[PDB]
């Protein structure tokens, strides 16, 4: 199946040429023009194929974060997105990732976020005198985060005229309040907001943090909890840092986060870090799983196993077992990271 | 509104005469014959009006246990179930509650579970050598519970030929495995299983335990947590105690628990205990609320407030705000407990 001949390579965004960057960006725009597949009565707010991906994430958020299926489900998700870009948008380039480490002293100068024509758009319109973001996970003390250097709609770049249609589902706001639609799958068109927060990166996504994550995680449990943020440490891990550092809407919504176009580059890096960690010890780590099928095991559910079946709903793909997802060179996958 | 004239009393099941016990039983059996309202595409496995109540519980479980609405939602839920009994089944008697304390040395002799024609059916067919029930609440060490003196389908009484149609959703088994239907709102007819476990009552629902709950809980948070089971404490509360002591299916499934006909008596007591606790200090406790709109706040959601609206779907009644649910003698309610 996976052979040296049909091996694809996943590459840092900093390693894409100007022409390669736009090829990718244009593909994603093409996803935002194509009509949605999700049946209107299940997600009335859906319009585009991109919406289809956003909807499944909202629909499944409760069963795909702090579960045994978190890493694998996301690996599939971004895989089937890539497959959309290829099969429907005629993309023939490589899957990009966002190397957090390289932008942690100055996020506004990040090639992902410089706001130029080769970025995923940039900062939001500056809003002064904003309160702090307070994240409560469960019932531990809230983590305190700076509001960032934007806050309003994105000012420049290829996604300035991009309409976000679904959400908000649980959007953290400056000051600590939280916006939640009666149901986030209905039509609520608005612009993508961002408030770039370099400080957040300084705390959680520096190169020391990333290496620590890889080298000090003895078991999948330790790995995936350190990545997501062990509730009660005041860490939100690399995965939280990457999300909240984008600020804005839906940067700060756990459910609607794919609504931000940097999601895919963010999760490319998640997948890369995971893949790396796995490969330090394939015999024990290749197929390791820990956790249940529910967020923090609340309500309790069965332990996830290789036999556990997961899907992307109407976004793309079909039902697929976990044993088919454990390797980037097995099942439906045949790629590495450079 | 509610006056001394139209006031209703809720009574201990032990205080029902043989005829009054039968009158209630026949009303519940009548709900198990009347056709459901839930539109079939939403719950394919619902057949009866009783099922409607089960289905809504399954649907909303994620947002009614360990939330700010837990107590108020259940008080409404059981009121609306009493209303179905009056309006559709001609019941004119009182709401019954199950006093856990009075049966905590020997549950098999309980007037609720004695297997007679005046009980909610009794124990299940005996199944020897069953392993221990292991409840994993969130990510804390497992709570061991004995397997009880039953296991099979109920052997006697009004509900021996009662068909349970929905679920399982997250059914804990002896040995520590858990059965979960791919989706539990589909048609899965089967008998009600029980495995009456006195020992669980001995640990969690004694008169000392119930009095501790009321007198030692200084605020609504302390109260609702102690009642449900504070996570990590190795306690499951009176709330968990009541359910798990029934054993069987769906006694051991947090989603489907209304499928067990004792659920309503159990929750009369829960409401009684809450009412009692409110009435020790009405200035502070009448409208006291704490917690969010998600199970253990996972994922994070807004704080429940008096303006938070809840519904029981197609079971009965309409949307209603929390402020209207706080008093047994205001809003739609006019009752007390003896
Ligand atoms: C949200 O997820 C639910 C499942 O949790 C999806 O509904 C299921 O879809 C399949 C269709 O193949 C049915 O056969 C199941 O019986 C459905 N289950 C339930 C509980 O409805 C639904 O597709 C998702 N909604 C969206 C918009 O993706
Ligand atoms: C929610 O209530 C708690 C007190 O229980 C408090 O810490 C916090 O201010 C409230 N949260 C919001 C978002 O208002
Ligand atoms: C379920 O798996 C968890 C780890 O995810 C483990 O602690 C527990 O012992 C397992 N139990 C069973 C019965 O599978
Ligand atoms: C379940 O809850 C959803 C979310 O509000 C609702 O729209 C749907 O009607 C409910 N289904 C049933 C069977 O009550
Ligand atoms: Cu996700
Ligand atoms: Cu993410
Ligand atoms: Cu309940
Ligand atoms: Cu209950």
UniProtKB/TrEMBL annotation, chains A, B:
This is DNA, SC001. Glycans are attached at residues 59, 177, 303. Keywords: Metal-binding, Signal. It comes from Aspergillus oryzae (strain ATCC 42149 / RIB 40). Cu(2+) 1 binds at residues 57, 65, 74. Residues 48-279 form the Tyrosinase copper-binding domain. The keyword Translocase does not apply. GO terms for molecular function: catechol oxidase activity; metal ion binding. Cu(2+) 2 binds at residues 239, 243, 267. It comes from the Eukaryota. Disulfide bonds join 2-334, 30-89, 153-191. The chain holds residues 71 to 408 of 408 of the full protein. The keyword Signal applies.
């Amino acid at each position: 199946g996976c052979t040296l001949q049909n091996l694809r390579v996943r590459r840092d965004w900093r390693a894409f040429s100007k022409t390669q960057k736009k090829d990718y960006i244009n593909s994603v725009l093409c996803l935002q023009k194509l009509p949605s597949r999700t049946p209107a009565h299940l997600a009335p707010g859906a319009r585009t194929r991109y919406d289809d991906f956003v909807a499944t994430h909202i629909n499944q958020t409760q069963i795909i974060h702090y579960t045994g299926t978190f890493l694998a489900w996301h690996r599939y998700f971004i895989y089937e997105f890539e497959q959309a870009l290829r099969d429907e948008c005629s993309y023939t380039g490589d899957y990009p990732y966002w190397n957090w480490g390289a932008d942690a002293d100055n996020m506004e100068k990040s090639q992902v976020f410089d706001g130029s024509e080769t970025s995923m758009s940039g900062n939001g319109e500056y809003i002064p005198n904003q309160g702090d973001i307070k994240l409560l996970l469960g019932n531990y003390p809230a983590i305190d985060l700076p509001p960032g250097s934007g806050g309003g709609c994105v000012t420049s770049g290829p996604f300035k005229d991009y309409k976000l249609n679904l959400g908000p589902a649980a959007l953290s706001l400056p000051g600590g309040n939280m916006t939640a639609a009666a149901n986030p799958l209905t039509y609520n068109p608005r612009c993508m907001k961002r408030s770039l927060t370099t400080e957040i990166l300084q705390r959680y996504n520096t190169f020391p943090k990333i290496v620590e994550l890889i080298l000090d995680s003895d078991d999948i449990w330790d790995f995936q909890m350190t990545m997501q943020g062990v509730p009660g440490s005041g860490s939100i891990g690399v995965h939280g840092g990457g999300h909240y550092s984008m600020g804005g809407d839906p940067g700060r919504d756990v459910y609607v986060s794919p609504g931000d176009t940097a999601f895919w580059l963010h999760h490319g890096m998640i997948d890369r870090v995971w893949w790396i960690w796995q490969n330090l010890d394939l015999r024990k780590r290749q197929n390791a799983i820990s956790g249940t099928g529910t967020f923090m095991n609340n309500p309790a559910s069965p332990n996830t196993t290789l036999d556990t079946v997961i899907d992307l709903g109407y976004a793309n793909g079909g039902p697929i077992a976990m044993r088919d997802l454990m390797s980037t060179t097995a099942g439906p996958f045949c790629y590495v990271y450079l």
